[PDB]
Amino acid sequence: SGISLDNSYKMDYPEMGLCIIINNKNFHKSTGMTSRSGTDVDAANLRETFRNLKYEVRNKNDLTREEIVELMRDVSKEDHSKRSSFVCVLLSHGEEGIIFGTNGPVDLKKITNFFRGDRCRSLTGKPKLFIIQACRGTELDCGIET
Template sequence: MSLSKIQDFMKNTKGNLIRHFDSIINSCRPRSRIRRLHSTSSNGSSGSTDMESYPVLPGQRGFLIIINNTNNRKGSEKDYDNVHSFFKGTLNYKEKYINNPTLKILKNFLEKITAHLESNANNYFGIFVFIMGHGDKDDQIKIQGGVIPVDDIISYFTNDRLRKFAGKPKSFFIQACRGSTIQDGVETDAINSAVPIDADIFKFYATTPGYTSHRVMTEGSWFIIDLIKVFKKRYRYKPLQIMCTEVNHVVAKRSASVNDKKQMPIIVSTLCKSLYLIYQGK
């Protein structure tokens, strides 16, 4: 082989090696950690947008409210234990609990809480309310001596009532029947602009309208059991909306031992951002 051919061979080999190592270095460079949601525009073209999250500042906690009716609801104490253990024990949320209240006592309880929240808004990034009791087709919860509509409870926390929480998330988890039909299975911080009164509300019902919800006397209700299990597994890195969709999936797979009866939770939401249960360190 002539000297010129040897020189050409060495030059080509060197170039190939340089390109090879460049590709290795590029593959090792860190990629952006910005999470994007892919979307499709009205003309069908695909794109991506950043999904903003509700702010959770260092030192801020969630505020947990549990309204429970244990009368003739064997196993409901297990639901309280599950909710309390996770939100208070694991997440260290501030907790207020009331059991078997009359309408007057419940209203007084809610008024005191909302007054506290308005006076201490900087301490909390969001509000989480569990409403557990017997329910009916009109979305009313039975309490001592009467009933109260779920929306009457929620009305204490809307942006016109809690102005210092405007723009902050308020989440409601309703463990109650919404009718008497048993469902069958089938095969297969500061806001600089006005916000709607009912914005930033998240409602998660144990079942769809018209149907019963299932409760096991020795364990608690399907909805609360599966909700807490999913939250414990995912809360560090998944937003509430994604976790609750997984709860839908898990509960929907359950079947009652009698006649293969089912249950389907439902989400009703006016949240405008992703909601994480803890500070994300961003």
């Protein structure tokens, strides 16, 4: 055939892929973390937005650190052969490199490692997107008038 460039990811597989949304609103009293009012609005908006992009959206609410890891592990072990990509949205409290389960922190690296090119072969060469709504520290931006 003619000249082939391959500058864009192949996104015409039978399925666009999964869009896993972890929506943590309520945390265990033991952690002292406050409820995240308004997060349900985010979760619903994401479900509708990615639904229209043809993603298989799966939502999970208030997951413990154990459940978050179990969820990610299970999903990474699925056969993604017919899926073009993978999307994971994390909505919770957090700090640099950390996302909070309802009973404690989870290293982002632990979550993403399940999807490494050598650990999830059916996603090798495919875009793996992680969308994170959480703090990354305690700095405040005072901004500048334009």
